[PDB]
Design a protein around this ligand. Structure first.
Ligand SMILES: Nc1nc2c(ncn2[C@H]2C[C@H](O)[C@@H](COP(=O)(O)OP(=O)(O)[C@H](F)P(=O)(O)O)O2)c(=O)[nH]1
Ligand SMILES: [Cl-]
Ligand SMILES: [Cl-]
Ligand SMILES: [Cl-]
Ligand SMILES: [Cl-]
Ligand SMILES: [Cl-]
Ligand SMILES: [Mg+2]
Ligand code: NA
Ligand code: NA
Ligand code: NA
Length: 326
DNA sequence: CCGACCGCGCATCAGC
DNA sequence: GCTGATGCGC
DNA sequence: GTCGG
């Protein structure tokens, strides 16, 4: 937070471009800038100093001067004053409601928490659950609770089949003292890039977790990706914990490393690394790293036996999880 | 300039 | 039913 | 909104 004022401003701007303007590239532009600046080990003294960093162009440079000078940005002040932008921004905070749905709702006169509640009829399943736990999903999860959640998940998975391997990724794997949710990578020997010898692999796990009342709701669920809600069990007479978002990703056992690299993130770190890969002539997804041919087409998967091998391919020194928080 | 900006699973819809 | 595009999210 | 060729 050495330059918290600036990164917050930029993040607010990114959110604006994304939710209201629906200008995803501008959104990422602001995010990257915010990211490179949050990483800057100095208290920025001017937009010019900031422009030296890659990702900070002329536009952001001027805004940083305005911010440093007056402690604010007129562009944002006006944005906050605009009722439609504010309503749209607010609705996009409900899981399941994106820029389009948000603007649509606002067009229908549905602009507040109260409006959503008296209009469940107009929401799809995901949006419905997102509204239900609106407040809870806003809360952070202390690492202490992430540790309790981890323990339940690994043990419950073990009970279903001893060969399952569940790895908690996301900010948790990066050493964060608090996480926005829980991310679980799952593998089983019977499921490889080569074949699927057992059906319902992800289902059995989800099922077991619902059985012990850890998983409470489902936002979306497929053969390899579960997106839902969970809650730690509370003791007698004590207030129950907030409900939490949980994502479970089943990846081919032989593609673990690409999978854990992907799920560990951060999201921006992934974007930068994938972008660098391309420049180096490779393409990286959660399953493999493949070279790009002369035609610019993905070739066959390259051999990977550790997260480091992926880093070596694109000529990047290895970065531990804790240093990938961009 | 000007195009590139990561890559993909699930839910939903239109069009057949 | 299917396929493909879109929205949304990670 | 920013960057590289
Ligand atoms: N390539 C790519 N990868 C993405 C993207 N979004 C999320 N990811 C990856 C990396 C996250 O760590 C991981 C989990 O997604 P996440 O949204 O839970 O992020 P996270 O790192 O856990 C956050 F810090 P928190 O949840 O604690 O607030 O999913 C994306 O847009 N592109
Ligand atoms: Cl854009
Ligand atoms: Cl401001
Ligand atoms: Cl791998
Ligand atoms: Cl692949
Ligand atoms: Cl680490
Ligand atoms: Mg997470
Ligand atoms: Na710059
Ligand atoms: Na949302
Ligand atoms: Na998540």
């Amino acid at each position: 937070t050495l330059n918290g004022g600036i990164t917050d401003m930029l993040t607010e701007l990114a959110n604006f471009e994304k939710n209201v303007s629906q200008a995803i590239h501008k959104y990422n532009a602001y995010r990257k800038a915010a990211s490179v600046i949050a990483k800057y080990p100095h208290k920025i003294k001017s937009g010019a100093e900031a422009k030296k960093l890659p990702g900070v162009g002329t536009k952001i440079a001027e805004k940083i001067d305005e911010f440093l000078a007056t402690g604010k940005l007129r562009k944002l002040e006006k944005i906050r004053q605009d009722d439609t932008s504010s309503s749209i921004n607010f609705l996009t905070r409900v899981s399941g409601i994106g820029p389009s749905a948000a603007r649509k709702f606002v067009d229908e006169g549905i602009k507040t928490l109260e409006d959503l509640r008296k209009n469940e009829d107009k929401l799809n399943h995901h949006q419905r659950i997102g509204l239900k736990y609106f407040g809870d999903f806003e809360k952070r999860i202390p690492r202490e609770e992430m540790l309790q959640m981890q323990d339940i998940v690994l043990n419950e998975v073990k009970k279903v089949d001893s060969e399952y391997i569940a790895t908690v990724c996301g900010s948790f794997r990066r050493g964060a003292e608090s996480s926005g949710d829980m991310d679980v990578l799952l593998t089983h020997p019977s499921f490889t890039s080569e074949s699927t010898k057992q059906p319902k692999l992800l289902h059995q796990v989800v099922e077991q977790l619902q059985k012990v009342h850890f998983i409470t709701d489902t936002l979306s669920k497929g053969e390899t990706k579960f997106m839902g809600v969970c809650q730690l069990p509370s003791k007698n007479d004590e207030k129950e914990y907030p409900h939490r978002r949980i994502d479970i990703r089943l990846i081919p056992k032989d593609q673990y490393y690409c999978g854990v690299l992907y799920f560990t993130g951060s999201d921006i770190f992934n974007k930068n690394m994938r972008a660098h890969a391309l420049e180096k002539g490779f393409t990286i997804n959660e399953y493999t790293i493949r070279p790009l041919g002369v035609t610019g087409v993905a070739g066959e998967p390259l051999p990977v036996d550790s997260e480091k091998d992926i880093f070596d391919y694109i000529q990047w020194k290895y970065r531990e999880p804790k240093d990938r928080s961009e």
